[PDB]
Symmetry: D2
Subunit: 317 residues, 4 copies
């Protein structure tokens, strides 16, 4: 039988005998994702160029903000686009915190590069009046997380306690069809992904690890290199094909990517798929944040590859 | 005032007082392209998972091949998908030879990477019965070339003598809308693109050129790196942002990886019409005389200051 | 705040502390409606005409039958297309009985007339093995009924004991957006709808009633006439503008042409929950106790003033 | 081979060795129709209902007026929405005059009735500076006409000297696929279509003919009745299934209701190229010489046997 995301998530919910708020949250999120996709693929563009005789990341944030508010399942919302946490109006408060990046990679959307939407969902932990502090949770607290990728097709990857499930958007009917069930990452890969133009500023251990991916001491074949420049695309490739992804800490002692709505959701997808994710000093999911836009270094992928990076990292520490 | 591809190409031909054949060719290609875009974004995929109770490479090739034949404007078709050249049947033959990759980058459609269609159009030059040899012309004989990119959005880039023009596919009405006219590549960029996993196979020229981009002897800012692994996406980003793209030879035969007829030549044509450059290292890509329809070539292309810098290094090691 | 079909129905169901099985049925039926819409608007027709080289009501039935079975919410399925009830196999069996017309008005799909999908849902009470007889229920046993209208736009109209709501399908995102809430029909309208070519076969009650709409007894403005010929379209215009719709018994004996279980009962239900009426002439449509799943019934529905007027003239003629 | 509007019309101009203006005109009109269809089907409607926090006849007229101007092929434009004809600015002037109804039948779009776009194309016969007089030609002077029907699917019907052809829109790729070539209407049909609610004001001529359809004298089968209320829908049905459609004179207007320049005349041309007829009662629609651009005309059209039969009943009563 064909299965959709809303049919999938309804059935886990019922079986957990819950209140329905998480299902309503994810439904609002799907409706947002479909709206973002239709605009990313430029559905309205002829009118902008004058067929009737006469902002993407802003619009994406607007979509995601309003759909989650309208779901009655949230109380605190943290977005890459907003300086402060948005507090949901009293009459619409539900019980979840949502940290998201509504259109990651769109810095370079000029070249029609792959972009995406990243989210992680926390159960509000305190009875207190909702505030920014309700988002300062370690990622090990997540009840759900994942991303939508607007690549050659549009796909939603949702991880939960039951595992990682991939849904393809069928744009002719507006339905997210379940196409890959309970996925698992290869225990060792053959690709490495990072920006080697920063090589002059590399941590000494990053330099050495990469140098071993190109010049293996042991007569194994070198790894191939891929780096789209957009995180949802580089991570999704690592899920599907295996390997390692690096945005590590030398200047930038904390990395460049943001912990709440980039590093933690991807670290959570990775671990539920049988993979790893480190800062180099601890698991990404074990960092306790003190600021909603704070940064974290991130290294994730197949577990044999991450463990190997850590081997070399520790030889330099 | 709004312009669409159909209207732009019809106008260029009208004041060229031509015969309509090329316009009929490009229109056929536009239909195929929009049909490919639909299938790549998966618009009927639910029927495939049983919604009513019960290969993207091959469909893309069928769509191009049938629509081109349909056009009455071609005689020889060369496709990445077919071992030998296709000869159009007598009753549908026109005067153009077409070389194309119907879905470049489809190797990695599994991870949903950008994919694209690349084409190059030649006037048949010989007066012989049409044959594979009609498609063995040097890239400098092209009358038209370009690519459809299925990325975050779907865009057609079309190069001709008039220059380079960029049309965005509006899916709501299914029309290609002119949005960047007579585009030109920046003289020098700040991004370099190549698969650095072949580092132990690069020749001394590539090795030194790369090192100049990470460690500038003039102490200017190092270049950033990007490599999608899908040629149409990397090349289009080179057009739009500047910089350089490379696929040099390696121990996968010293002949390079990318195909001359339907990958390197159409992109090199796009780049030179945009004020850029494209070299094998030994010669310009557009001057290679082919001997085989699927032969490979190495390519270094992009902004002109960046390819020239590459070429001054290559000369120092020559 | 924007609302949708999924969110509206999932909240009514949580409020009722139900099992969510009715929601599984409705979500699955909404999927089927969206694919029927796509096919009715001809979203792949170019492939049928050969662009790559190489039934609508049949496919609508296949869509509804397979989506309903996999909801795990039905046990007996009655369709205009099928001679007998279909009995869902044990492993997929749920408590609801559905009767539906998967693409009504399909006879004139050649002229691009509006068509639609009609449905009505009963709870199965007993403990017995499911059987065709479980669908032989009066329409007052309905827990939900409605229709999808494929007109200038596609719209879903859904009636439950909480009232009638109307959801517009947004093709760009594939979502049913609530646009009219808790809808109520005009007390009295100014339009009447029937196939008047059967004038020579009308009951005297119908002929007087019609002549009272053209030569009214009180110098009212005569009514206008509209008859599209596709039931879903005629009934929806009646819901939105007011007036009366009639399919009486011509030669067809005091029986008429339309079908009681999957045409007459769902529209009678939508009319009554929206404050209208529906009568056979002799009784309320929703009171008829049926003995055959494909039995027919006379039907007269619309604004309550207009139906009371006809029923007044009807009684004078008995 | 699969054929599209743009390829059909382009090949028609080639054989005539034309200037490209009429092809430009129809290309721009098709683009306007695709955007109308997307709008009519409510493609971005959720944004209206607050999905991101923060008209239809106006938009259609805007789309048609702007695309026609941008086509470089027109000089005077008449639309139902504008009291005065639009004069195209000198820079953008071409040789054609277009009369159109941008969204016919839009009044009752709220009940999701079929709607459509009607057009008629004349060549400017005069010599002086272009003026509203350039639209006051008889329908006999028409170079081409037709309509778009926004029904269950969207179809453009196209009429010129080579006959009538029907192109279906495939919304997945936005191409108009030719699906019925050189169509011709049946010699005699079995359907009559008119607003019978105004029977109290009928000409004695149509009250006899209409009774001949419900009580045939030879005791053959009586006709069926259909009236949508939307001209483009009722007329398309007549073209496809045969029969007769009526909006006659009486005293609601001695000159009927529909407008001659952009409703009756395009539909009279389509019919006559299809082997049908179109009369005012007094004369053939296409022979009236207008004196006002917005003037009205009675219309009786359809299958030729049917219309001659109406004419005789009308010849009798005068
Ligand atoms: C791990 O994945 C998830 C995903 C979502 C959730 S949830 O919080 O949003 N709950 C739902 O979705 C949910 C609950 C539910 C439901 N409850 C129920 C049943 C029996 C007794 C009872 O007394 C407490 C309650 C009945 C019918 C239905 Cl259709 C239901 N649905 C959809 C939780 C975990
Ligand atoms: C540089 O870009 C291009 C693009 C396309 C072509 S072409 O070969 O396909 N020709 C066309 O497209 C074309 C030609 C044409 C046309 N010709 C014409 C005019 C006057 C005299 C004459 O007697 C020989 C012929 C008239 C009207 C129209 Cl609407 C036309 N169209 C569309 C060539 C170059
Ligand atoms: C009038 O409209 C309708 C429409 C549909 C239905 S239903 O049969 O299809 N079931 C649902 O809808 C449903 C139920 C449900 C649910 N149950 C629940 C709640 C509290 C106590 C309890 O202890 C037995 C059970 C929890 C969470 C959620 Cl999200 C739920 N949903 C969606 C009923 C009426
Ligand atoms: C009733 O059917 C129609 C439909 C449209 C038109 S038209 O006015 O718009 N012309 C066109 O469409 C047209 C013309 C044309 C063309 N002309 C030509 C050929 C030879 C000598 C010459 O010396 C002046 C001119 C060449 C190539 C092409 Cl591809 C052409 N096209 C498309 C007219 C009638």
């Amino acid at each position: 039988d064909v299965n959709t995301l809303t049919r999938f998530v309804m059935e886990e919910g019922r079986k957990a005998r819950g209140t329905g708020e998480l299902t309503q949250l994810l439904n609002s999120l799907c409706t947002a994702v479909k709206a973002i996709s239709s605009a990313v693929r430029k559905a309205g563009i002829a009118h902008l160029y004058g067929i009737a005789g006469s902002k993407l990341d802003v619009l994406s944030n607007d979509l995601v903000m309003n759909m989650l508010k309208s779901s009655f399942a949230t109380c605190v919302l943290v977005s890459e686009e907003d300086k402060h946490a948005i507090i949901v109006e009293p009459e619409k408060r539900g019980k979840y915190v949502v940290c998201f990046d509504p259109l990651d990679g769109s810095s370079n959307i000029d070249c029609l590069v792959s972009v995406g939407t990243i989210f992680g969902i926390y159960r509000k932990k305190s009875t207190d009046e909702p505030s920014e502090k309700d988002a300062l949770q370690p990622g090990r607290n997540l009840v759900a997380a994942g991303y939508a990728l607007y690549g050659s097709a549009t796909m939603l990857v949702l991880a939960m306690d039951c595992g990682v499930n991939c849904f393809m958007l069928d744009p002719a009917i507006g339905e997210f069809i379940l196409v890959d069930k309970d996925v698992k990452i290869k225990k060792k890969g053959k690709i490495y992904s990072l920006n080697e133009g920063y090589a002059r500023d590399f941590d000494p251990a990053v330099t050495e690890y990469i140098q071993r991916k190109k010049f293996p001491p042991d007569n194994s074949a070198p790894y191939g290199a891929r780096y789209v420049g957009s995180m949802v695309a580089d991570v999704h490739r690592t899920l599907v094909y295996g390997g390692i992804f690096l945005y590590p800490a030398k200047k930038s002692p904390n990395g460049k990517l943001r912990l709440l709505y980039e590093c933690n959701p991807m670290a959570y997808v990775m671990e539920k798929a049988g993979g790893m994710a480190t800062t180099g000093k601890e698991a990404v999911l074990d960092v306790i944040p003190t600021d909603i836009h704070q940064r974290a270094p991130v290294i994730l992928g197949s577990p044999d590859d991450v463990l190997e990076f850590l081997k070399v990292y520790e030889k330099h520490s």
